[PDB]
């Protein structure tokens with residue numbers, strides 16, 4: 001679990017969005033596993049606007065942060081799960097690192113701010129949904 005709170009927006013994994021997220025929907029994209037909903041309180045986070053490929057993410061299954069080198073946002077095949085059919089997920093960045101079910105929502109940050117959130121995982125792999133292109137989160 002986990003969310004980014006920026007301005008009057010909350011960014012979550014689309015597959016973990018609550019009834020309240022859908023009732024306050026701003027934007028969602030099943031191909032990116034992202035959903036953004038509106039909030040009344042002002043957020044705590046700031047978003048990176050950069051091309052970093054290294055950073056640090058939070059891994060809830062280890063209660064720890066780990067450094068990572070990750071690929072640029074791209075279209076990557078993701079196997080079927082209870083949440084989605086087998087499909088290509090866009091704007092996904094892969095890295096070598098620990099991940100297990102329950103780790104989605106963990107934040108990836110670089111020196112400039114929040115880069116994205118954990119969205120997928122494999123055997124020694126972790127995938128992050130990028131949010132750096134969503135320029136409207138800031139205004």
Ligand SMILES: NC(=O)[C@H]1CCCN(C(=O)Cc2cc3c(cc2Br)OCO3)C1
Pocket residue numbers: 015033078081083084089099100101102103104119120121122123
């Ligand atoms: N973005 C999606 O399509 C995700 C929907 C929820 C399911 N999903 C995953 O990847 C789950 C997952 C599977 C794992 C793992 C870590 C994670 Br996270 O390590 C070993 O096998 C895919």
Ligand SMILES: [Zn+2]
Pocket residue numbers: 048049050051052110111112113
């Ligand atoms: Zn950066």
